[PDB]
Design a protein around this ligand. Structure first.
Ligand code: 9VY
Length: 559
């Protein structure tokens, strides 16, 4: 019952891999301690192979099926549509992996005869054959990190044409079903502001609250054949088209339950009998399965009035405290129940009695005050990885503009404001590329964002508060200042002076650039300005952004 089977054929790269941090003329103005930033190469694969390969034992009790019965009752109310070849195509990222059958993401998007005809052929094959496994490619992910070295994380994905077909059958399912099944617990519906709003309102809803995060070790590898089959039965509860029922049935048996692994060179690396990293249903499946096992463990553990938040594999449980000795006991029962459902933790879960001490998705809640002195809750994180990736992106132009994702995800934070905005606007001005749109991958999907749109984007994701925050927690300020010392990043005082300049430079540019100057760098001035909401913000079409998450989803959005 192993998560993976292997042959001995190595996981081979598709290109040349740079491990050591590239050095520009701009590099030293951001990060001086270069020997601390590295990128994971395919050389590291053999170590992840070991970690992600283990046997899984599942013991399903009455709490599991009781919760499943309920999830299916909600699922039965969902009606989902079969996406047109044209709709799924228009949802393909432009720099998505090409097909082995002579067409690319650009071909797919422009609706080329060659591309359209193959998608039609793969779809037909899906409807006629429900048993032949579908091949997948195994790739080592080249991600940037800081010291104190991780091995290369792995991505399993099917051919371009299968990804278009997954979208036709399940894009509407993954979009509408999880909120119906999980309610306010489906994390992927919330904008960062909506999420902080949810946790606080939830933390407050409890007379005496206790919360904890639960992180399963290699969650993808803990997902079993029953788990994947159980998810299919949730999808099949929807009112679907017969063509969608068959295609979902086919994709499950032939791709989702598992299949063979192949490298870039095309050698059989082995077999997968667990969750694929690069399938549409990764984010959605992991959310439903994590919620199902967690909900059932709460019952098992007898946790009092538990509200939870599920985001893929990241889980947070906020419940009514029964007492410190009781909560800590209840927690070990939760872990024991979880373990039985084949989802044990990496490090054990700790009960927390302060919302600001729970960490999930590498983030935690913090406080600052808006212009009028009012306490404002925002999500923050340790700036170490965002800053090390920003240093990598200072010298190398990447398909993922980590820093732009970071600015969009963490606009109200001290560090995103003072360092990421300041540094990258300085670069954009120098290169005259403020108006040049950038594809940026955020925790799944790909977004085409024009930097000039950051003020209006931020206002709709965080509010005007983000441009007015001050009086940050000392704990936050110290986490940031220690990180800057660790990485050799100039002190925050240096960034306020540079920001005054970038601000002045943006204002002298007029229009949208001056709107970027006025709003993003208003913290830098002593003689502040009282900001108003931006007219263009309400006119931005953010439909389909936060309806759901799409891990290996291969989903694209534009403005
Ligand atoms: C179960 N755990 C949680 O729900 C999260 C917790 C938490 C839970 C309990 C706690 F006590 C303390 C923290 O913090 C999170 C931070 C998160 N960010 C990284 S952020 C600050 O919102 O941008 C996310 C998250 C996950 C997936 C996403 C996004 N965000 C996200 C933002 C985003 C965007 F701004 C534009 C476009 C796409 C976007 N996505 C697409 O996918 C989830 C969580």
């Amino acid at each position: 019952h192993h998560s993976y089977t292997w042959t001995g054929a190595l996981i081979t790269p598709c290109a040349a891999e740079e491990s050591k941090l590239p050095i520009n003329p701009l590099s030293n103005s951001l990060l001086r301690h270069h020997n601390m930033v590295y990128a994971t190469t395919s050389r590291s694969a053999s170590l992840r192979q070991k970690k992600v390969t283990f046997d899984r034992l599942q013991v399903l009790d009455d709490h599991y099926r009781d919760v499943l019965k309920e999830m299916k009752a909600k699922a039965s109310t969902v009606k989902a549509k079969l996406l047109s070849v044209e709709e799924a195509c228009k949802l393909t990222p432009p720099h998505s992996a090409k097909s082995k059958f002579g067409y690319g993401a650009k071909d797919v998007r422009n609706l080329s005869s060659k591309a359209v005809n193959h998608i039609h052929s793969v779809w037909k094959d899906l409807l006629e054959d429900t048993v032949t496994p579908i091949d997948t490619t195994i790739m080592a992910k080249n991600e940037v990190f800081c010291v104190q070295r991780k091995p290369a994380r792995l991505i399993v994905f099917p051919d371009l044409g299968v990804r278009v077909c997954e979208k036709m059958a399940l894009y509407d399912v993954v979009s509408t079903l999880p909120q119906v099944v999980m309610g306010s617990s489906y994390g992927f519906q919330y904008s960062p502001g909506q999420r902080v709003e949810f946790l606080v309102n939830t933390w407050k809803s409890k007379k005496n609250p206790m919360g904890f995060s639960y992180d399963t070790r290699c969650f993808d590898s803990t997902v079993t054949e029953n788990d994947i089959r159980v998810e299919e039965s949730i999808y099949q509860c929807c009112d679907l088209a017969p063509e969608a029922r068959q295609a979902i049935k086919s994709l499950t048996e032939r791709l989702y339950i598992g299949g063979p692994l192949t490298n870039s060179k095309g050698q059989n690396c082995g077999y997968r009998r667990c969750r694929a990293s690069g399938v549409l249903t990764t984010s959605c499946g992991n959310t439903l399965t994590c919620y199902l096992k967690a909900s059932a463990a709460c019952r098992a553990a007898k946790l009092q009035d538990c509200t939870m938040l599920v985001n893929g594999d990241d889980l947070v449980v906020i419940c009514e405290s029964a007492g410190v000795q009781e909560d800590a006991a209840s927690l070990r029962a939760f872990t024991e129940a979880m373990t039985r459902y084949s989802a044990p933790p990496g490090d054990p879960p700790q009960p927390e009695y302060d919302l600001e001490l729970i960490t999930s998705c590498s983030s935690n809640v913090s406080v600052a005050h808006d212009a009028s002195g009012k306490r404002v809750y925002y999500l923050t994180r340790d700036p170490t990885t965002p800053l090390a990736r920003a240093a990598w992106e200072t010298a190398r132009h990447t398909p993922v503009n980590s820093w732009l994702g970071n600015i969009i995800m963490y606009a109200p934070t001290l560090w995103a404001r003072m360092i990421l905005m300041t540094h990258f606007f300085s670069i954009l001005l120098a290169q005259e590329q403020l108006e040049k749109a950038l594809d940026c991958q955020i925790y799944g999907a790909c977004y085409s964002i024009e930097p000039l749109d950051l003020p209006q984007i931020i206002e709709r994701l965080h509010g005007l508060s983000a441009f007015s925050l001050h009086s940050y927690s000392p704990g936050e300020i110290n986490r940031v200042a220690s990180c800057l010392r660790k990485l050799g990043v100039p002190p925050l005082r240096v960034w306020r002076h540079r920001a005054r300049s970038v601000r002045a430079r943006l204002l002298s540019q007029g229009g949208r650039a001056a709107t970027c100057g006025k709003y993003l760098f208003n913290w830098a001035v002593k003689t502040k300005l009282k900001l108003t909401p931006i007219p263009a913000a309400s006119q931005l079409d953010l439909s389909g952004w936060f309806v759901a998450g799409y891990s290996g989803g291969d989903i694209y959005h534009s403005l």
